[PDB]
């Protein structure tokens, strides 16, 4: 039986994979431009929320 | 690389001469002295003379001395 | 403590400082630019404009003018149409 | 083919005069003299960069200045070169700077 | 002090030119002779086009022509100016004041225009 | 009103009518500096008028720092004469005063909050960006920086008449917000 | 002159080792590349000498 | 879920490797969770009671924070490690 926990765990794993994906994209653009990147700006909270 | 941009520089010098207006053909060694090509090896110069100078359409050969063809371009 | 108010981001000020210190590329004389271009072509037969700009350290427009004067764009199977530094 | 700053100083002038004497004597070719000057420029730049570890100060007034090709040509008057160990007074000075 | 630095510079220069003297095929005695000689030598105008209406609007240009006065040659890291004053972070360099030479690493300067 | 703004800086542009070599001007001029990496023009300074001029290869020059119109014109002529003495065919063509800056004090503190509330259409007061209130006068095209200390700086004027007219217009408004 | 020629021959002897060094790995090519790089610096470095002579 | 799975998922998420030369490494270390909070239009946080959420059509959610260590290797033989607490 998949209760609230395991189901939410599956969703959260998917959304965290996403979050790291956009973090990688955002940081990669700045790194390619040669300028350092702001970690706080790299994070999209709306993904998980 | 080696021995290519020097040839390009010689050809550009010929265009500069033609913006100058000196129709009289010039000696290749004198051109080298003007363009600071003394350092380059002599064998490359000989290969240029035998092959590249004749292949270049703009270049012409008169009385054993190489210069542009005043007929090719419109006057 | 997250997203604390700040006049300018540290990365942004560092990048701006680097840009200001480096300064814009200057338009050098045609003779010197041409000599550098010919030297580069000796090292490599085919050059992309983006890397050629880095090698020459000249404004893109000025370099494009000088390169249009002599070199010619060839449409090729390497990946795209690129400049050819050989005048002919 | 280098920075070429210290040539127009006492040291560079002495080296140039010596090279001129050898050239007059045919002992050395002008290309060799130029090579010697280039090597001297490299060595002197390295030596001043490395073996000098003293700070100096100075004050005064500026009468002229010029800049071209990253070359400053300041012209100061009534300069006082102050150092912790000694103080030097000069009526006029020309500061040539490069980078 | 300064003479000792000069001797160290001599050593560096000779060591640096040895390889060139081998490359050019010249005999090594040239370096000895060079060092000997070097040491010995050391020790209502409506029509405004005409600009002639003003004269003597310049100064004597012979200072730069002479250059006989004291001369400082160095490298600059930062040079700032705020509307009156010129500020100087000149790094390691050489100075020729009254013939005697001075050596420095950090030079700080303030001047007025 | 009894108060007249006093000019702090004047900008004037003049065409020399001939192309120039910036490197040659930098090498031969007295107080000129040329950094193509930083700026594309040559910056020169003359102390007696106490002004700074930027000279471009196109032959057009901009003179700034002059406290008076006569000083600006004389400084522009002096710069042109220096360039001419350097051998170029420099002339004095279409000299014009592009912008004038004036300053003054009203000698009383001002309530910028009330002023902006009354004249929101022309006022802009953002203490976060700049402590001085920016007022955009329409009838004269003048921008006024008004400060709580009473200092007023007018800019954007082409002639001294605009500066004086703008101050005359603003003074009655400021007097109504005296603190 | 003969002695000088013999000395010169040793140059070619050691240029053989140079080839074997390419065969071990190109040293000559590397030297040529190094020479190519200096040209630009020399031109920039040179530019200063002509103007400094005019200045002083 | 909250105590074990969220933290374990964050830990198991591979470190982010970036390079394009300097290279950056991002590692998520610790999970922090505050009490359910609601932000007023003025931006002032305040605890959100479930009855208030029901009445005001809010979502009974708790802010989630991660400790993130960013290490940059500049290839200059020095690496700078900076930790952002509770991002």
Automatic annotation (TrEMBL), chain A:
Entry's transmembrane regions: none
Family as reported in the entry's similarity comment: Belongs to the RNA polymerase beta chain family.
Taxonomy, superkingdom: Eukaryota
Cited function: RNA-dependent RNA polymerase that catalyzes the extension of a non-coding RNA (ncRNA) at the 3'-end using the four ribonucleoside triphosphates as substrates. An internal ncRNA sequence near the 3'-end serves as a template in a single-round Pol II-mediated RNA polymerization reaction. May decrease the stability of ncRNAs that repress Pol II-mediated gene transcription. DNA-dependent RNA polymerase catalyzes the transcription of DNA into RNA using the four ribonucleoside triphosphates as substrates.
Subcellular location per the Swiss-Prot or TrEMBL entry: Nucleus
The protein, known as: DNA-directed RNA polymerase subunit beta
